[PDB]
């Protein structure tokens, strides 16, 4: 069944949660991350439903 014959193989039994994790570059920089991620950089898509899918009214047709 499972790729690993061993029954145990979990690195962490429980996960943790947090509100936000802002990073600081220097004094006076409450920025988000000052990360290079911008419009020029494209992120890998990973959404099931989005603008790519549209809906039509069955009664209208």
Partner 1 sequence: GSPEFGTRDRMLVLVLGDLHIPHRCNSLPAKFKKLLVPGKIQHILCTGNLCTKESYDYLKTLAGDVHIVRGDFDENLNYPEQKVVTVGQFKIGLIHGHQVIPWGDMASLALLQRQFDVDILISGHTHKFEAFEHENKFYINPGSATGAYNALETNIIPSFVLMDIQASTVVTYVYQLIGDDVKVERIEYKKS
Which residues of this protein are in contact with Zn ion, per CB under 5 A? Answer: 25, 29, 31, 34
User: What is the footprint of partner 1 within residues 13-42 (CB under 8 A)?
Assistant: 25-30
User: Out of Zn ion, partner 1, none, which partner does residue 37 contact, by CB within 5 to 8 A per kind?
Assistant: none
DSSP state of 60: T
Closest to partner 1 by CB, 18 or 38: 38
Q: Give 4-33 as a DSSP string.
A: SSSS---S-SS----S-----SSTT---S-
- Alpha-carbon gap, residue 9 to 47, rounded angstroms: 29
- Residues in contact with partner 1, counted by CB under 8 A, come to a total of 6
């Amino acid at each position: 069944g499972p790729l690993g014959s061993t029954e145990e193989d979990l690195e962490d039994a429980e996960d943790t949660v947090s509100a936000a994790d802002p990073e600081f570059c220097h004094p006076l920089c409450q920025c988000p991350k000052c990360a290079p991620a911008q419009k020029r950089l494209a992120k890998v898509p990973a959404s099931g439903l989005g603008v790519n899918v549209t809906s039509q009214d069955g009664s209208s047709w």
